[PDB]
């Protein structure tokens, strides 16, 4: 219970929060902060940090003042401000979501503008046009350092990571596509999860490849392009209908 669990957080101290870029290119472009004169390198690298939320989550300088938006850095697991952060440090609970449900159309749970069109890769901060709570997970091969695991095991792992991060609606691992679809109750929660699990390893301490988790490439967590197979579609339609009904009720 994050309020009475703790106050403190201090995820990654301001001594070592991050080095700035990773060398692609020959020369370093001061204006873009991106290496130039060459592009060789798959670029996506695994997060040095992570959100162990039960430990970390806490009261902030924001909580007292009445901040709406949660801390991106906290989600990522590297908020060096900690208790003096102005953005919130906890998993988005229901009440909080309700409170910022007016704004949640235009901008994310992080207080940053949702766009009109999706990014072509479905890669970040979803559109305000299509509301969504549904994350594509990918690069699970790369996130587990090419480990010969059972799909079931992988699914379980995903559940473990994602359940903690937010109230789950439903999850699907797929062998053929080699992916992990997750759906949440609240869009905000989903967003938070995405922020967290971007570039994260799925591995555990008990695994034998724990010390070389950094050398791999992390989870590619993105937005879900809707499932075409028909039952799912039907379900979605039903949900939409229900929503409409609710809206109508509210109106009258």
């Amino acid at each position: 219970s994050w309020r009475d669990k703790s106050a403190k957080v201090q995820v990654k101290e301001s001594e070592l929060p991050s080095s700035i870029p990773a060398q692609t290119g020959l020369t370093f472009n001061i204006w873009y902060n991106k290496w130039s004169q060459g592009f060789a390198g798959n670029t996506r690298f695994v997060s040095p940090f992570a959100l162990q939320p039960q430990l970390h989550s806490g009261k902030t300088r924001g909580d007292n003042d009445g901040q709406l938006f949660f801390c991106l850095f906290f989600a990522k697991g590297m908020c060096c401000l900690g208790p003096k952060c102005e953005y919130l440090h906890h998993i988005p609970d229901e009440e909080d979501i309700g409170k910022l449900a007016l704004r949640t159309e235009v901008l994310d749970c992080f207080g940053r503008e949702k766009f009109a069109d999706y990014r072509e890769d479905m890669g970040g901060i979803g559109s305000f046009r299509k509301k969504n709570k549904t994350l594509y997970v990918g690069g699970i091969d790369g996130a587990l350092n090419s480990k010969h695991l059972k799909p079931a095991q992988i699914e379980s792992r995903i559940r473990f990571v994602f359940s903690r991060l937010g109230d789950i609606d439903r999850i699907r691992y797929v062998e053929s596509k080699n992916c992990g679809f997750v759906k949440f109750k609240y869009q905000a929660n989903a967003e938070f999860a995405k922020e967290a699990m971007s570039n994260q390893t799925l591995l555990l301490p008990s695994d034998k490849e724990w010390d070389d988790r950094r050398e791999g490439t992390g989870l590619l967590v993105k937005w879900a392009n809707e499932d075409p197979d028909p039952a799912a579609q039907k379900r979605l339609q039903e949900e939409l209908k229900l929503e409409s009904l609710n809206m109508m009720v509210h109106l009258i």
Partner: protein, 209 residues
């Protein structure tokens, strides 16, 4: 010359004085990607985080929406939903293209539905029509896990596949489970025949892929 900002009642705030700054060609509208004046207000003086307008007035007019909330000017519903309702009683297709979106924005037709929402005549009629229209343990036998979890809590990690329909709840405590049993949709430990059959079928389906 400039038209005025279209900010809703709930968008703007609950107070009888708000101060805002206008920033002419501040940002590009999110829909249209075309320069427009940003209004941004603080609601109450001291309440943190600003509320900048994210869309151009023209676009707002077309969709008939709050320039901050992105919700129907009248009913305060997401554009999809409001439009969907109207359809139920045709929806807008924002054209997600670099050039075309701008063109669409500049058109002044009130895209789709917006007209109905604008007019007292039409919105009201639609509403009326709508009204008329209206008037450890495995678990077996689709619904979301956040509901299941809630139910469990009420009764007092929770895995559930849907292709399987096979929910293996693991409280990890003999106390929680033994309280859970007494205080009380097939629920064993770690038309019945029909149910069994269906379950089996589901399992088979899960296992063929």
């Amino acid at each position: 010359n400039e038209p005025p900002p279209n900010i809703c009642e709930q968008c703007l705030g609950d107070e009888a004085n708000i101060r805002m700054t206008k920033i002419p060609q501040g940002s590009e509208c999110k829909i249209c990607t075309l320069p427009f004046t940003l209004y941004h207000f603080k609601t109450s003086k001291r309440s943190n985080n600003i509320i900048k307008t994210l869309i151009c007035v023209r676009c707002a007019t077309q969709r008939n929406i709050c320039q901050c909330c992105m919700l129907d000017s009248r009913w305060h519903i997401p554009i999809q939903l409001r439009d969907h309702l109207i359809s139920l009683v045709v929806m807008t297709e924002e054209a997600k293209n670099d050039m075309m979106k701008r063109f669409l924005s500049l058109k002044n037709v009130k895209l789709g539905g917006a007209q109905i929402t604008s007019d007292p005549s039409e919105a009201d009629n639609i509403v009326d029509k709508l009204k008329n229209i209206l008037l450890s343990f495995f678990l077996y036998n689709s619904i979301p896990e956040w509901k299941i979890t809630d139910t469990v809590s009420q009764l007092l990690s929770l895995i559930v596949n849907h292709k399987a329909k096979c929910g293996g709840l693991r409280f990890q405590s003999s106390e929680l489970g033994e309280r859970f049993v007494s205080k009380i949709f097939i629920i064993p430990w770690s038309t019945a025949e029909n149910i069994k059959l269906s379950l089996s079928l589901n399992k088979l389906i899960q296992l063929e892929l």
